[PDB]
Amino acid sequence: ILHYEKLSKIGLVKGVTRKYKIKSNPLTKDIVIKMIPNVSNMSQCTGSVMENYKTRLNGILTPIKGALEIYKNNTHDLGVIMAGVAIGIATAAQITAGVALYEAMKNADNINKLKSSIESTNEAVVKLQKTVYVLTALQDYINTNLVPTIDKISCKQTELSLDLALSKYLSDLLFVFGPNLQDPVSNSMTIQAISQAFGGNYETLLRTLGYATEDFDDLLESDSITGQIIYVDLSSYYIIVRVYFPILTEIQQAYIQELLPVSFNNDNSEWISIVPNFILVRNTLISNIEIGFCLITKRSVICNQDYATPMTNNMRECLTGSTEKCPRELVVSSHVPRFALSNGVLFANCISVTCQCQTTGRAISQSGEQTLLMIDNTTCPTAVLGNVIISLGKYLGSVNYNSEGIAIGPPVFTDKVDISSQISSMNQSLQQSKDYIKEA
Amino acid sequence: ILHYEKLSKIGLVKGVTRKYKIKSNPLTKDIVIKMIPNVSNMSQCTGSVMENYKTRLNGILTPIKGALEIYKNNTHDGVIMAGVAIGIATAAQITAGVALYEAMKNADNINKLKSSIESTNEAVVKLQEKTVYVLTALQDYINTNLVPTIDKISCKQTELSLDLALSKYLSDLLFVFGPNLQDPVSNSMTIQAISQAFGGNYETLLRTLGYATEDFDDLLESDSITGQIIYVDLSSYYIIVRVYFPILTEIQQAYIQELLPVSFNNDNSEWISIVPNFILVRNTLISNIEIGFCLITKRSVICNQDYATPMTNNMRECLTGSTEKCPRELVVSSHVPRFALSNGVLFANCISVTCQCQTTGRAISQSGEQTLLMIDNTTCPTAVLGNVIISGKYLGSVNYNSEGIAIGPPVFTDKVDISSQISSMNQSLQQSKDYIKEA
Amino acid sequence: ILHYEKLSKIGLVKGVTRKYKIKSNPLTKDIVIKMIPNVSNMSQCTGSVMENYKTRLNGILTPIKGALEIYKNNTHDLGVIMAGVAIGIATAAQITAGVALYEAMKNADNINKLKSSIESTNEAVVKLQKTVYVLTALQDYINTNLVPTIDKISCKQTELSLDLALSKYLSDLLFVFGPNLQDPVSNSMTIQAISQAFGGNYETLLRTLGYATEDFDDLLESDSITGQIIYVDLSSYYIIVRVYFPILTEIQQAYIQELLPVSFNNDNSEWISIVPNFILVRNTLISNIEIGFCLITKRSVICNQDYATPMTNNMRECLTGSTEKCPRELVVSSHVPRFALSNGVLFANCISVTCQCQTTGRAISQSGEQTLLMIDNTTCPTAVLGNVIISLGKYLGSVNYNSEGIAIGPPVFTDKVDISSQISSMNQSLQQSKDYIKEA
Amino acid sequence: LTQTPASVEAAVGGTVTIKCQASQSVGFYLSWYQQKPGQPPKLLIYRASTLESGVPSRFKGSGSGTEFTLTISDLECADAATYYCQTNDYLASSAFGGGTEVVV
Amino acid sequence: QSLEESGGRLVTPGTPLTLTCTASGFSLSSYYMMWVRQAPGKGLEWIGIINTGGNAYYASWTKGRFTISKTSTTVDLKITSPTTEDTATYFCARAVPSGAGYSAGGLWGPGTLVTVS
Ligand SMILES: *[C@@H]1O[C@H](CO)[C@@H](O)[C@H](O)[C@H]1NC(C)=O
Ligand SMILES: *[C@@H]1O[C@H](CO)[C@@H](O)[C@H](O)[C@H]1NC(C)=O
Ligand SMILES: *[C@@H]1O[C@H](CO)[C@@H](O)[C@H](O)[C@H]1NC(C)=O
Ligand SMILES: *[C@@H]1O[C@H](CO)[C@@H](O)[C@H](O)[C@H]1NC(C)=O
Ligand SMILES: *[C@@H]1O[C@H](CO)[C@@H](O)[C@H](O)[C@H]1NC(C)=O
Ligand SMILES: *[C@@H]1O[C@H](CO)[C@@H](O)[C@H](O)[C@H]1NC(C)=O
Ligand SMILES: *[C@@H]1O[C@H](CO)[C@@H](O)[C@H](O)[C@H]1NC(C)=O
Ligand SMILES: *[C@@H]1O[C@H](CO)[C@@H](O)[C@H](O)[C@H]1NC(C)=O
Ligand SMILES: *[C@@H]1O[C@H](CO)[C@@H](O)[C@H](O)[C@H]1NC(C)=O
Ligand SMILES: *[C@@H]1O[C@H](CO)[C@@H](O)[C@H](O)[C@H]1NC(C)=O
Ligand SMILES: *[C@@H]1O[C@H](CO)[C@@H](O)[C@H](O)[C@H]1NC(C)=O
Ligand SMILES: *[C@@H]1O[C@H](CO)[C@@H](O)[C@H](O)[C@H]1NC(C)=O
């Protein structure tokens, strides 16, 4: 559909085709994260560090609880009804997450019956009776570093070490749980950030809960696993979070096509074509895609959400076989691609780089008219480019491709500072043309 | 003066209005940061790690001293700076140099305790002078992890572990104090970056210095608390840094208005208006604002500078109730907001989402002519949007639904498509110019 | 040839002139990295944590081995005859990296004959045997924290702490060695990333090999030191990485000019010119530079590749004298620079910032027609700008600098939404002009 | 943990080499002493490469893990007495090695 | 500067004995004080070391038959249950302060012959 033959001559070689995948159908699992270590041991000498740390942590936690109780208060059973006047201003996602928060409030209340048992845990990871897992913070450090060496070093140093550890933990935590978290009523926060309450060790957090799946790494990397806070307690200083495990469902009749660029020689200068690298050909509707946010696995593009964006008419018209509308940028740098390999056949610019034929020895060159040179099984069995010798396959397209010839589109400059100058010059010229026309 | 009612018909529903704040009036606090631990308790095991560490640290530090001396050699007793010697410099650099010279009195007073500074073995010490707090890097780790096990493990493992710790600390420090930092004379370096010398916990530094305010967290998060280097020692390997504590001063007659977007329906297609989300109305003069560098809290917006930017006349004309000038962008994705609730009323493109009332049990439908549908008490009390049921009134025009308004032309905001649009546009302009010239 | 005098009148005061340096001529070294610590000294009670860790790390490593095996199986020595047909879709950089990978494979086998002696090592950094260095990962922590305190705490606590440490190491390592690493056959990965297998301790990694060079720090901070993976052993769970040490070379007859801006005023309002800050005058050809990626030192700019980009013709004219060509933008903020110093001469916008010099004792005034004011010895020596006193030198340009005036270009706006708005408005105006022309 | 010096060289007027190897690795930490009859030992080398202040330019020895050797370059009558190589790595237990006789 | 140490006369097996180092010319708390033993016509033997504080580490081959103690300006090595094997010339040495490891024996004492009947 993309008419790759004509696109190749302007230095856009067809790449690998990938499937398109997006998450759906999450599954919920609760987990309790404590924010204060249980220093039951070595209590005989701890100083006033714990009081100061608790006072500091209370200020960090209070805004989150205050934000949650806006949606936890004004909500009643019927589905679940909501008070539009009381809530004030809210978006669609915020309400769609508040409904889930109210739904999970029942399990949060069920878990809260074990407050005394949660507050008495003195180990990094424990389980309490379904089962609920408690992940204390900094408990491992206290149990393995401070407690064993309690007698060896004077406890005045132990107090300072504990204070430093707590300060480091709070410094790490503030980057995520600080004022930057303006809205805790959304379920679009990754687990790699929710785990900062546990020290950034989300591997243990995920392994503790069920994770049975053969596509776990792809799901985790794409930031498609998210957790939501559904309860905050300011007496025992713990938070009940709920993690979502989705499943990747590939879209039907949709794929991602990559066109790796190649510089081409025209009018004694080498140019580079300006066309989107990744094209989402879904249901024969060509469109762009924000590949930056998504993950590119060797066999599929995995996205958190449908990132397709519209494409201008000219770029659609050119990708279909009208090379006259694809802009080209000048190349003043010296480090740019100059040849490529696509299914055996090799597309190379045999002017910037030196081309040769190992089997025969004779050099292979292109005139000033040809845009690119295609080296295949018939032209040269083995091509020597620079210092690499490469065998070549056969072209499945036109018999005569090297001697076809096509016109090229107009040049442009894509520098950020030059776009404004180009716009100003165009407007300037428009006013001049208007004045000239009005004169006659 | 934005005519929010007319904007709501193209998916720009008025959101939350916040006040605008900026820092000012800093207070100065000096603090020493010793960069080398004291290993006098376990010197049997040091070997040659200390020599290499000191060599690398001196190599790292000397450029900073060379840069600071440029501004310390010339400034003379207000304070007159020799412009000829400096040669090339901006205004910010000149101001920073003036402040650095002014700090020399406290720098010398602190330096008077050079003998006592070098002989401290603890994570944080307090030396009376006014009192100055001396911090140390890795001295807590050496005290509580290596010294206790000096007898349990061999002197070859202790040396290796100490070398690894020093190397890791240097690796972490190079990101900030390496060749990247080539402008030491400046007070725009946040305390979070400066804390890398002490180990990365700026909480200990700030607590030791003493912060006295209730809005300290807001100042800290918005990169409003910065520090400067006023003296570096290549003999004892310590740097004296001055921390600035500013105060937020809310600006008068200035507020930021937020516009929640919504996708409306036109010509059997879903479109989203392209208009800035945050609008800074200050002294009844609309203008843009750069939100990337500004912290956003629930009730206000805090920035460390004035980020107001000029806004094109067309945007200001449109925001004042002229929808013909506001462009649109087509929507092909299936994940875009389709409804929004404001002041109790519900604005929702009612074709894409099955919006259906509850009290009377019927369904809410919109004709193709309408762009957005407004739902409030009058229509019916409770609305069942998708899987969520919800329950106010609209204080604006009574006949909001059946009004209709003109809409602007479409555009494409893709990064690559801008160049293609410009090129085709020019192509078209050149053709018209040639045609005009011909006749 | 930038006409500094004319450019200074619009707030483009000349800055420091710097040299251009680009990495070139790498030197190769090899080093082994083990990823599973030895627990032989505390093996009596360690649970089954190591089996699960091995199972997870095997899955993590298998994709890399599979990706590498493509070139190893398909490459035969003659140079080296690349298969071409089997490789299929490939890039020039990928092929150039695969050739180097095959060339390094010859030496990668010699290191592989010490496998029996690579698993036995139980030190963080060890030297075997023509030398080989083994950097075990997460081995110092076990030797210093766990083994010494085996008897002090119960074996269950030790096992839990070891599991937590392994999980944290995996969490740290999964950011770069996970699905993100789609292309392992490439020598463009920084040593900082490669050291993640060693816990972000690249300083030790480079110190072990030996950074025998004076410009080591600039190369390190410019991402000029890169590593490549040339083997993966799943049975023993280790990887052989080859590090490159390149030397900086200066491009002759090339330099970079920095133009620091000032906020001039015109038509009773402030303005600021929109012109690129850094200009690469290479071989007396003006061009833009992607200074964001390069590293800016005090007297040089270091880069890993030529970043020069084309410059629009209408922008070259402004740097060559035609000031009216280049654009300007309005200033509404109160933080823009308002004065600057260059070679002991002050360029100040005296209307915005009050001007005065103590020598005469009277104020310095600027007329509405003027844009910027040049203050030096000729006028009065010691300026009192703001609250900073400064002594000025002498100007080398025309004596009657202030008398002469120049024309200035048209205003523009550079906001992201304003670009689209201007394009739409300009496209609308052109349509009306075309319709008017057609009607007549 | 265990030492085994066995050289027992009896050369006069020329360089003499004494060698000892530990049972297990001892890193770079090992000291070479000297003991004339009727006098306490005096440290000659510590860390296996460093010279104790006072000793002449000679007495240059070196080695690596569990393998060390001291070479007496310029030999004379004054330098003839027992030599020991002590492991000094562990604080808990440091042990000496067998005596050697230069018997010049 | 010289670590002069008091000697010990021959004692019948089964009776305690005590030795002391009369350190002079230097501070005794700055450096460790290792103890060494040498049987006649035999190699040197290590019999423990004392930290700056009251923490003395002993050799493996001795089953707590010795007692290392530190006084204000002297150290003591008390012996219990002496036998024929105990005969030797005990030496008093101070470890090198740094750069050599534990028990470097920078300076040594004259030594005293503690014979056994
Ligand atoms: C102190 O720690 C030990 C080991 O963890 C544990 O057995 C003991 O119960 C702790 N103290 C109490 C009373 O919890
Ligand atoms: C929710 O209700 C609780 C209990 O009345 C109250 O303390 C809290 O402030 C309320 N929160 C909000 C913001 O409505
Ligand atoms: C290329 O030519 C060889 C003989 O030289 C032939 O066997 C092969 O099938 C041809 N086709 C391809 C795909 O290379
Ligand atoms: C516009 O088009 C003309 C001719 O096609 C060309 O000379 C000019 O460089 C172009 N300039 C801009 C502003 O794009
Ligand atoms: C285009 O130029 C005209 C006249 O100079 C001006 O009025 C108009 O605002 C400009 N519009 C833009 C910003 O393109
Ligand atoms: C600045 O003064 C110090 C005083 O000793 C001197 O060492 C230094 O060299 C001076 N700097 C220059 C650039 O001369
Ligand atoms: C280090 O030694 C000094 C003097 O003996 C002592 O006061 C201090 O507590 C020791 N510190 C550690 C880490 O044990
Ligand atoms: C909507 O109707 C209810 C009564 O059903 C009334 O209480 C409420 O005030 C009305 N809306 C508003 C916010 O005025
Ligand atoms: C300009 O507007 C016309 C008509 O509204 C449209 O056909 C043309 O594609 C537009 N060009 C661009 C790319 O702005
Ligand atoms: C520790 O392990 C090593 C081998 O890795 C072994 O030789 C030694 O006996 C073990 N025991 C000790 C001293 O840790
Ligand atoms: C490459 O060769 C090895 C050895 O036969 C084989 O195990 C492997 O499957 C081959 N192919 C790939 C892509 O791994
Ligand atoms: C500045 O003025 C003084 C006095 O006129 C003169 O000597 C000097 O050359 C001028 N420029 C300088 C200071 O270099």
Side-chain angles (χ1 to χ4, degrees), chain E residues 15-28:
Chain E
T15 187
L17 183 63
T18 188
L19 287 78
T20 176
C21 310
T22 299
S24 66
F26 72 104
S27 45
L28 183 63

PDB file of all heavy atoms in Angstrom, chain E residues 15-28:
ATOM      1  N   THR E  15      52.084 -22.977  88.810  1.00  0.00           N
ATOM      2  CA  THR E  15      52.003 -21.728  89.548  1.00  0.00           C
ATOM      3  C   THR E  15      51.928 -20.547  88.585  1.00  0.00           C
ATOM      4  O   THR E  15      52.587 -20.562  87.541  1.00  0.00           O
ATOM      5  CB  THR E  15      53.218 -21.554  90.473  1.00  0.00           C
ATOM      6  OG1 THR E  15      53.030 -20.404  91.308  1.00  0.00           O
ATOM      7  CG2 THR E  15      54.490 -21.379  89.660  1.00  0.00           C
ATOM      8  N   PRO E  16      51.143 -19.518  88.902  1.00  0.00           N
ATOM      9  CA  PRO E  16      51.020 -18.383  87.982  1.00  0.00           C
ATOM     10  C   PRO E  16      52.294 -17.556  87.925  1.00  0.00           C
ATOM     11  O   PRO E  16      53.100 -17.541  88.858  1.00  0.00           O
ATOM     12  CB  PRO E  16      49.857 -17.575  88.569  1.00  0.00           C
ATOM     13  CG  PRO E  16      49.875 -17.899  90.018  1.00  0.00           C
ATOM     14  CD  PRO E  16      50.339 -19.325  90.123  1.00  0.00           C
ATOM     15  N   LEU E  17      52.468 -16.862  86.801  1.00  0.00           N
ATOM     16  CA  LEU E  17      53.611 -15.984  86.590  1.00  0.00           C
ATOM     17  C   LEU E  17      53.147 -14.752  85.828  1.00  0.00           C
ATOM     18  O   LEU E  17      52.170 -14.801  85.079  1.00  0.00           O
ATOM     19  CB  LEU E  17      54.732 -16.699  85.824  1.00  0.00           C
ATOM     20  CG  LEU E  17      56.021 -15.911  85.589  1.00  0.00           C
ATOM     21  CD1 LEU E  17      56.694 -15.552  86.904  1.00  0.00           C
ATOM     22  CD2 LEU E  17      56.962 -16.712  84.708  1.00  0.00           C
ATOM     23  N   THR E  18      53.859 -13.643  86.025  1.00  0.00           N
ATOM     24  CA  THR E  18      53.479 -12.368  85.434  1.00  0.00           C
ATOM     25  C   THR E  18      54.702 -11.664  84.866  1.00  0.00           C
ATOM     26  O   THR E  18      55.784 -11.700  85.459  1.00  0.00           O
ATOM     27  CB  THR E  18      52.793 -11.458  86.464  1.00  0.00           C
ATOM     28  OG1 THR E  18      52.259 -10.302  85.808  1.00  0.00           O
ATOM     29  CG2 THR E  18      53.778 -11.022  87.541  1.00  0.00           C
ATOM     30  N   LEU E  19      54.518 -11.027  83.710  1.00  0.00           N
ATOM     31  CA  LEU E  19      55.539 -10.209  83.072  1.00  0.00           C
ATOM     32  C   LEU E  19      54.949  -8.841  82.764  1.00  0.00           C
ATOM     33  O   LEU E  19      53.733  -8.696  82.623  1.00  0.00           O
ATOM     34  CB  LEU E  19      56.059 -10.852  81.778  1.00  0.00           C
ATOM     35  CG  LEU E  19      56.969 -12.075  81.921  1.00  0.00           C
ATOM     36  CD1 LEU E  19      56.163 -13.328  82.221  1.00  0.00           C
ATOM     37  CD2 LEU E  19      57.802 -12.263  80.663  1.00  0.00           C
ATOM     38  N   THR E  20      55.818  -7.836  82.665  1.00  0.00           N
ATOM     39  CA  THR E  20      55.379  -6.472  82.407  1.00  0.00           C
ATOM     40  C   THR E  20      56.366  -5.769  81.487  1.00  0.00           C
ATOM     41  O   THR E  20      57.568  -6.047  81.511  1.00  0.00           O
ATOM     42  CB  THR E  20      55.230  -5.669  83.709  1.00  0.00           C
ATOM     43  OG1 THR E  20      54.899  -4.309  83.402  1.00  0.00           O
ATOM     44  CG2 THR E  20      56.520  -5.706  84.519  1.00  0.00           C
ATOM     45  N   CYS E  21      55.843  -4.848  80.676  1.00  0.00           N
ATOM     46  CA  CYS E  21      56.646  -4.000  79.799  1.00  0.00           C
ATOM     47  C   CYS E  21      56.620  -2.586  80.364  1.00  0.00           C
ATOM     48  O   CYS E  21      55.572  -1.931  80.365  1.00  0.00           O
ATOM     49  CB  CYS E  21      56.116  -4.020  78.366  1.00  0.00           C
ATOM     50  SG  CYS E  21      55.844  -5.666  77.677  1.00  0.00           S
ATOM     51  N   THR E  22      57.773  -2.112  80.839  1.00  0.00           N
ATOM     52  CA  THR E  22      57.886  -0.765  81.400  1.00  0.00           C
ATOM     53  C   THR E  22      58.140   0.225  80.263  1.00  0.00           C
ATOM     54  O   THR E  22      59.231   0.772  80.087  1.00  0.00           O
ATOM     55  CB  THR E  22      58.988  -0.713  82.450  1.00  0.00           C
ATOM     56  OG1 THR E  22      58.670  -1.609  83.523  1.00  0.00           O
ATOM     57  CG2 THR E  22      59.134   0.697  83.006  1.00  0.00           C
ATOM     58  N   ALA E  23      57.094   0.444  79.471  1.00  0.00           N
ATOM     59  CA  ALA E  23      57.190   1.362  78.346  1.00  0.00           C
ATOM     60  C   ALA E  23      57.505   2.771  78.832  1.00  0.00           C
ATOM     61  O   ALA E  23      56.959   3.237  79.836  1.00  0.00           O
ATOM     62  CB  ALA E  23      55.886   1.360  77.547  1.00  0.00           C
ATOM     63  N   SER E  24      58.395   3.450  78.111  1.00  0.00           N
ATOM     64  CA  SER E  24      58.794   4.803  78.466  1.00  0.00           C
ATOM     65  C   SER E  24      59.143   5.570  77.199  1.00  0.00           C
ATOM     66  O   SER E  24      59.534   4.982  76.187  1.00  0.00           O
ATOM     67  CB  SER E  24      59.988   4.803  79.428  1.00  0.00           C
ATOM     68  OG  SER E  24      61.147   4.287  78.799  1.00  0.00           O
ATOM     69  N   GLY E  25      58.998   6.892  77.268  1.00  0.00           N
ATOM     70  CA  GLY E  25      59.336   7.762  76.165  1.00  0.00           C
ATOM     71  C   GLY E  25      58.256   7.933  75.119  1.00  0.00           C
ATOM     72  O   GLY E  25      58.469   8.675  74.152  1.00  0.00           O
ATOM     73  N   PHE E  26      57.109   7.276  75.275  1.00  0.00           N
ATOM     74  CA  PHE E  26      56.034   7.390  74.301  1.00  0.00           C
ATOM     75  C   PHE E  26      54.717   7.044  74.975  1.00  0.00           C
ATOM     76  O   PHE E  26      54.686   6.388  76.020  1.00  0.00           O
ATOM     77  CB  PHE E  26      56.273   6.477  73.094  1.00  0.00           C
ATOM     78  CG  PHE E  26      56.094   5.016  73.395  1.00  0.00           C
ATOM     79  CD1 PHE E  26      54.952   4.347  72.990  1.00  0.00           C
ATOM     80  CD2 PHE E  26      57.066   4.314  74.088  1.00  0.00           C
ATOM     81  CE1 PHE E  26      54.784   3.004  73.268  1.00  0.00           C
ATOM     82  CE2 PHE E  26      56.903   2.971  74.368  1.00  0.00           C
ATOM     83  CZ  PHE E  26      55.760   2.316  73.958  1.00  0.00           C
ATOM     84  N   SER E  27      53.626   7.497  74.362  1.00  0.00           N
ATOM     85  CA  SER E  27      52.298   7.182  74.869  1.00  0.00           C
ATOM     86  C   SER E  27      51.949   5.735  74.544  1.00  0.00           C
ATOM     87  O   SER E  27      52.110   5.286  73.404  1.00  0.00           O
ATOM     88  CB  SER E  27      51.262   8.128  74.262  1.00  0.00           C
ATOM     89  OG  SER E  27      51.466   8.280  72.869  1.00  0.00           O
ATOM     90  N   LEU E  28      51.468   5.006  75.547  1.00  0.00           N
ATOM     91  CA  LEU E  28      51.176   3.586  75.405  1.00  0.00           C
ATOM     92  C   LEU E  28      49.797   3.315  74.819  1.00  0.00           C
ATOM     93  O   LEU E  28      49.525   2.181  74.413  1.00  0.00           O
ATOM     94  CB  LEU E  28      51.303   2.893  76.767  1.00  0.00           C
ATOM     95  CG  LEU E  28      51.095   1.379  76.800  1.00  0.00           C
ATOM     96  CD1 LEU E  28      52.149   0.676  75.960  1.00  0.00           C
ATOM     97  CD2 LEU E  28      51.128   0.873  78.229  1.00  0.00           C
TER      98      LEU E  28
END
